[PDB]
């Protein structure tokens, strides 16, 4: 099979042992669960590898995503079965790196995971992305602007599509950025500590996949409370770059050999 169950979930033990795609409660070997707030998502790494080969084969990345909505919705989806929260208590994603992983981008020996580009409104976050040699920017949760008609972009509607597009692109060897996680900052309630654990979750999926995804985050903190929040975000992900008035004031990165620190301002 290749479709995702949307409304029929397991009611018997036999059904409960099937894959998340088929409405059961047990991930198949190629399914990875991604907890985000009170939601649970799943990535199917077989469909992901099939999409990554197809993408790298085509003569247009932007055009490929627009005409393959259906495989994108098989790549990352929200399992229908309701007992997942109970069966996997305090679920995270396990910190694990594929063998032979290498990276020169965003920085040398960058651990796979998330690289956050953070700062208040107007810090220069989008001007920062435009100098990182992205293949395209995945646009999510932000009001349409000039860049959306002129730049190398692909617009998405929900977190499944944002993650899926970033995953397929990076597995095909391209460089994605997501602009932005605004809806995750606003959507996760009761700043919430669940935001930090969602970021570790999404980080460690990129880590298991051997990729780095650049992600813009405006955390909506006070000056007073900006330092707290930035230290907690840093402790949650592979890399974080703080922007202030166009320039990097602070950077922290986990690498394959240790850690690197950046102080500007």
């Amino acid at each position: 099979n290749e479709t995702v169950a949307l409304v029929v979930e397991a009611t018997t033990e036999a059904e409960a042992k099937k894959s998340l795609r088929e409405g059961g409660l047990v991930p198949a070997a190629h399914e990875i669960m991604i907890p985000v707030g009170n939601m649970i998502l799943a990535v199917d790494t077989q469909v992901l590898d099939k999409c990554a080969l197809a993408l790298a084969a085509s003569d247009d990345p932007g055009r490929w995503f627009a005409e393959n909505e259906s495989l994108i919705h098989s790549t990352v989806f929200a399992p229908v079965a309701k007992g997942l929260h109970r069966v996997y208590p305090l679920l995270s994603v396990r910190p694990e790196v594929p063998a032979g992983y290498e990276a020169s981008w965003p920085t040398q020996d960058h651990m796979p995971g998330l690289h956050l580009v953070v700062g208040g409104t107007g810090a220069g976050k989008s001007s920062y992305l435009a100098s990182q040699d992205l293949t395209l920017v995945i646009r999510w949760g932000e009001p349409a602007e000039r860049f959306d008609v002129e730049g190398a972009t692909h617009a998405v509607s929900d977190l499944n599509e944002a993650l899926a597009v970033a995953f397929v692109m990076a597995r095909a060897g391209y460089r994605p950025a997501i602009d932005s996680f605004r809806n995750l900052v606003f959507g996760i309630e009761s700043i919430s500590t669940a935001l930090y654990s969602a970021m570790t979750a999404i980080n460690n999926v990129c880590s298991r996949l051997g990729i780095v995804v650049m992600v813009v985050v405006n955390p909506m903190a006070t000056e007073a409370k900006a330092e707290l929040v930035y230290n907690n975000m840093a402790a949650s992900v592979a890399g974080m770059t703080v922007l202030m008035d166009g320039a990097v004031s602070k950077q922290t990165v986990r690498t394959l050999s240790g850690r690197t620190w950046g102080v500007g301002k």
Copy 2:
């Protein structure tokens, strides 16, 4: 004759695959989902264009409007299926612009989206609207005034109707405004962040439709935080005009040659 499912929703995988209109969980090509707070509405762009074309092509567009209010209103509805929050997590609306879009109103090269007219009580908002040469003010969630009885006005009850009339009018080439988003401010909960993403969602529906809709918003903000609210609201929408004691005190707009 194929109406909107109000109570029966998909129980099987095969029903789950149908359109939101029919009670499934998968948008049809012409359905756009609109997340507002914890609500999910849907615009049917085929019903939308049907209505907008009948309006823009009429010899008497005012009469066609009057005779088809119910049809116009059915353009936006609330899907019945319950798992939509799960299937489309942290839903927003795609930021994209139709090919060949151009605009002169409310300013030159205005990005499609919302244009917010903001301010506190008495700042002169209704006086600013009378100067924008609008076709129609859609009146929602405000107490009946003299305007509601003798102005170029159309009164609605809920958000479905308010967006529907704004969408149809603007697609038919007219200039609509909504007075006001009062019930979003009060109904969604120094103010609720869900208000900002609701405005981005509605902004991007307009952006996808290549239209501009002008909307009145009283954020009901203390004078301290009022500057920070207005900045958060500007970062959510295409354009915003602040009023302070009868005068335009600020205007920021994103355009097709760069955000002024």
Copy 3:
């Protein structure tokens, strides 16, 4: 024709019926009133039957006690659960009947609510006595001498209170509600849901072309008191503020413009 109380629509055919019958679609003579997380409905045809029957008798007070079953049919709470989803952020549309005229509470007073506001001891009873009311509808306040002696009708819930005021005002009589205390206490997180609830009730009055005077003690701090009063004023046709027995402030939306009285 009776109001459905437990059986609601479970099929699309049933859902097309009126609110009275358990459906999700208002008949032409049904108007929905959103109040907090509640949705009520007024049946304008039952309202008009009641308003004619009440104008026939000589005793407005006695008619209401002997017809509890008709007013519970005038304003009721629909049983169907999906109304919140189907009518998102519901309000009531601001519209006016053709040929509406009013000399009371003020000249050309827009139809809607007239709020009489003030804290405890602010002069409320005195002010209603000066407005030549048919009778005061009493709701959610402790019984006092006035309930024994004065021209009153005592109700229990918000349906009854709106029903009685509606039938009275359409029958030409002149009602006041004392008070919206349970609406101030029952709608909270005071909640901005209180302001939209009064806009809703206000525009129901304007669609029926009536004015209903209503006592409200929003009961907030002096500091935040004037901010609350302005928000209430922005929600309704008219508002009168009492303090120390005297009218401190009045705002009225009129058939021409806006009236600002300040004492």
Copy 4:
């Protein structure tokens, strides 16, 4: 039998069943049923059972013995209807402010409106002490730790709000003088104090008003002693009479009268 028991679990699922009494599992009160909203709860008093009890007590040769023998019947005066749509059907429910014809009173003060008479104050203010002066028939003891008095006084101990209201209503209709010590579980159980406490007391006050009785009730609102005056004013704004105690003396008495 079948005329006197309350639906505990089965509620109306048809329109014919919904039209029956609250006792029977329906959603429309009988002529003799008064709904009492307390917080998010809805109780009901059956005035017909209440008057059975009050008359048999007031007319008995030995009212003490009749009480002792009919406690379970007395307690069944107030109950909690089983039907779920009541909150929807009766939005923002209160109780009708209304006084029977020919009501007169001398206690607790001359011409005291029917309703609640609150005895309020902080921990140790002398509240239970002040009851000994009001020359009472019975103190109904609810939600308080057992003490001497619960062994040697004119007391009736109860477990829940139904029983407490039931005994106070029956006693006061029989012409006696009851007091509830106390509404502590009202204050705790209803979420500086909740406005729902104020509307609860108005509701219970207006039941007493409709029955032409006065019931004396002890209430410690647990207020900070900065905000206490504001609280005491809101409580007095909700009931017929209020008496505050500080350090063992009456420091304020406000009472609504038939004049």
Copy 5:
């Protein structure tokens, strides 16, 4: 005669059965105990049966271990869901059995709870060693030396902590419970007022049973709010002892004849 665990009344005839059988009406020998948003029940008929068996046993500690089943039948949580509606604002009624006498914990001590109160390190558990207790019931505390060498009985939940105390006291023994830490932590609403009503409820069951149960309680109050919290606690129970630096700094007890007070440093 066993405890219904999952099947509750669905007919009126079933609803009139006892709490044990899944009904909504206590038998004559059943007392409901409301605790927070929970409702427990003691079966005084099974209680008396156990107190006779325990009294005729050599080893109290060893008897309790071999009788988990009789204990779970002595205090339990009824399965029927409508109890909160049927019994609004439920408490336990204050009444005292005929012919009740007490010399312990003090002379003429009212039946009820005797609270041993303090902050961390106050000497609470050392005070217990001087009250000359049959056995300490250990609940919700990390295991320590005393659990290996001491006269203890370890339990897991509030039912068995109350049951074991009830059976011991009714058989003439002296129970202390160390501690009510999980009430303080478990009961929500500077501490929750529902804690005070829970203590009154448990107090008055003890009262109705004609027993005294000693209970260690750390209310976790800021030193600001300590005298207020202690005063609310004192007003909720028969007796309370406050410890500071190993010594009794405050005491209050309701007796059969009046009130007693103690003041230390």
Copy 6:
């Protein structure tokens, strides 16, 4: 045997079955573990089968690698929904098995948790490297160099973290969990008292099993409230080591000598 995932007890006869089978009554070898509003269960028979196979194995290393799935199944979450009601305010019995003795982490250390506590940067992972551990179990932390090179086992949820720690320690090895970060974040209400009772619960399971498990906890407290928090945590567990600026600033331990 296999664990009931979706079908729970509907009759009194089913309700009396084990937690594994969808019932509401623990078997003799099932210990319930309340953690926040969750209730887990450890099956000590599966636990001891796994521990024995590890401890008896010629190459314990490859037995672990080949049997991860089964080890993880040592701890599960019962499907029966009435557990909270039936076991009000659930904790774990404070008991110690007979003949328990311990040389590590300190001499005569009570069985239970040994918390390694501090703020970000305090030096905790470096203190783990000095404790002579068999395995660091990595849970809820972003992937690091350590997760590529070190003596490490990565897990996804609290069931797996507890199961690997229980099985390793029962087999005679020294496990540590890095870290309880998702307990701190996930059990909410300067922090929820529920975190403290969760640690006592897990602590007493370790006590009943006669083991010590070392756990890293960053409670994310303000500098002011820090000492108060650290005091509350030490009151909840067997042992606690506080780290500041790379060094051990405090260590309290409950002992058999006591």
